[PDB]
Scaffold this motif. Structure first.
Motif, short mmCIF file in Angstrom:
data_model
loop_
_atom_site.label_atom_id
_atom_site.label_comp_id
_atom_site.label_asym_id
_atom_site.label_seq_id
_atom_site.Cartn_x
_atom_site.Cartn_y
_atom_site.Cartn_z
N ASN A 251 0.85 -1.16 -0.03
CA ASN A 251 -0.20 0.12 0.06
C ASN A 251 0.82 1.27 0.12
N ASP A 290 -2.75 -10.23 -2.73
CA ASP A 290 -3.38 -9.02 -3.40
C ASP A 290 -4.47 -8.93 -2.77
N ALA A 291 -5.29 -9.80 -2.25
CA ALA A 291 -6.61 -9.79 -1.59
C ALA A 291 -6.62 -8.89 -0.51
N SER A 295 -8.02 -2.32 -2.48
CA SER A 295 -8.50 -2.60 -3.97
C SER A 295 -8.06 -2.13 -5.34
N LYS A 296 -7.81 -0.79 -5.32
CA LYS A 296 -7.41 0.01 -6.43
C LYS A 296 -6.06 -0.66 -6.76
N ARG A 298 -5.18 -3.84 -6.83
CA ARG A 298 -5.13 -5.24 -7.32
C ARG A 298 -4.93 -5.32 -8.61
N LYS A 333 -18.83 1.29 -4.46
CA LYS A 333 -17.35 1.28 -5.07
C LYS A 333 -17.60 0.86 -6.63
N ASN A 335 -16.64 -1.72 -9.71
CA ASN A 335 -16.30 -3.15 -10.07
C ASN A 335 -15.82 -2.88 -11.56
N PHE A 345 -12.06 -6.33 -11.62
CA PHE A 345 -11.61 -6.17 -10.69
C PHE A 345 -12.57 -5.16 -9.54
N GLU A 346 -12.78 -5.90 -8.23
CA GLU A 346 -14.14 -5.52 -7.60
C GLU A 346 -13.62 -4.58 -6.39
N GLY A 347 -14.42 -3.74 -5.88
CA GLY A 347 -14.41 -2.93 -4.67
C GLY A 347 -13.41 -1.87 -4.65
N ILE A 348 -13.34 -1.22 -6.02
CA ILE A 348 -12.33 0.00 -6.22
C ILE A 348 -12.92 1.25 -5.57
#
Ligand code: UD1
Length: 349
Positions: A251, A290-291, A295-296, A298, A333, A335, A345-348
């Motif tokens: 991060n 990565d999880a 999230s951005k 990933r 967020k 996806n 890619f989810e949750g960004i």
């Protein structure tokens, strides 16, 4: 002897006096600390200025026969000579509060810190980390504090922590050499503390080259990042905590290092060198980590690990422009699919 103050110098004649005055003005016994100056083959009068403090400070001076290419080798030479129970690294263009050694000695005596962070202050424009210095804290961890956002060596370290675990600076490296050193010291310490009672470490911005703006190839830079990932994953810690520390390091790195935005800023024709070196670093990071990162990041980890600059660059330009190939909004967020046929890619956020 309580402290060894370690000072690498390199053509430091215009400012080295401010540091040495701050060491001689310590309201702490001069018998209880030493100043270990290793000169990286200066051509100016740096050493003649240092010698005016011979009878004022407990002074150790030596000089390397040729310039080593960075702070690492002179600090390593100094660390070997050092006899203090603790070391403090101060750069030649900085200085320290007059109560620094007194306050730190009093704090260490009660809490037995292995690594003591001391609050820094920027001088004429220099930016300095502050998010981990809002409070004095006898005990902090890599996972419950922001210490990972400050990897500079301008801290107090127990000398046996460094030497018993063979912790040195990489040599012949203009910058990022401190990140591995301090991450190693963090990973091995039994207790890490933060002393924020006043401004202790003053970091200046003079001119001439500052190391942290000198050229280092992507290859050399990202080899230090890989070594850090190897170091964390090999620490003697529970597996989940190691993954969590690596994620926090990632991060920090993707937010604040030259990696951030490199596909927008680096000449197109240089970017394959960047993605090959970055990918060698990300390939040391197991994919399960990565999880745990923001999230951005990933998709950047994904395309770095595949050494895929075209998709890495599409991600960065998409973020910057706010234009995506496809995306859903779920739970406030994004996806995002950045390119036809590619994963979502989810949750960004
Ligand atoms: C983040 C912070 O607060 N300080 C760091 C920052 O300072 P910074 O970017 O200001 O780097 P400097 O130019 O001041 O170099 C740091 C120190 O190394 C010495 N020097 C420099 C060149 C050389 O060839 N030989 C030599 O010994 C300097 O005299 C100085 O004492 O980037 C350096 C490179 O990662 C770090 O090591 C510094 O500790």
């Amino acid at each position: 002897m309580k402290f060894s103050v370690i000072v690498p110098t390199y053509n430091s004649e215009k400012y080295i006096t401010e540091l040495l005055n701050s060491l001689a003005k310590q309201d702490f016994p001069k018998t209880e600390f030493e100043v270990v100056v290793v000169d990286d083959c200066s051509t100016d009068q740096t050493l003649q200025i240092v010698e005016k403090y011979r009878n004022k400070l407990n002074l150790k001076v030596s000089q390397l026969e040729t310039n080593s290419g960075g702070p690492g080798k002179p600090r390593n030479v100094a660390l070997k000579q050092a006899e203090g129970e603790f070391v403090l690294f101060v750069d030649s263009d900085d200085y320290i509060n007059k109560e620094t050694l007194k306050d730190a000695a009093a704090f260490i005596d009660e809490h037995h810190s292995d690594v003591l962070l001391i609050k820094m202050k920027g001088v004429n424009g220099r930016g300095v980390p502050q998010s981990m210095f809002k409070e004095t804290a006898p005990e902090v961890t890599l996972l419950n504090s922001r210490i990972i956002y400050t990897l500079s060596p301008t801290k107090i370290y127990r000398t046996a922590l460094l030497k018993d675990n063979d912790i040195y600076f990489p040599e012949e490296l203009k910058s990022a050499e401190d990140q591995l050193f301090t991450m190693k010291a963090y990973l091995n310490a039994n207790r890490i503390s933060v002393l924020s009672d006043k401004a202790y470490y003053y970091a200046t911005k003079r001119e001439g080259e500052h190391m942290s703006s000198a050229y280092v190839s992507p290859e050399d830079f990202y080899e230090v990042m890989r070594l850090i990932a190897v170091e964390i994953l090999n620490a003697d810690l529970e597996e989940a905590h190691k993954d969590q520390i690596l994620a926090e390091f990632l991060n920090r790195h993707f937010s604040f290092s030259r990696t951030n935005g490199f596909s927008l800023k680096v000449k197109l024709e240089e970017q394959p060198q960047w993605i090959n070196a970055l990918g060698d670093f990300i390939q040391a990071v197991p994919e399960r980590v990565d999880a745990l990162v923001m999230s951005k990041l990933r998709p950047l980890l994904h395309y770095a690990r595949a050494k895929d600059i075209d998709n890495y660059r599409t991600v960065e330009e998409s973020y910057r422009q706010g234009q995506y190939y496809r995306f859903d909004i779920v739970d406030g967020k994004l996806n995002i699919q950045f390119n036809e046929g590619e994963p979502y890619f989810e949750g960004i956020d």
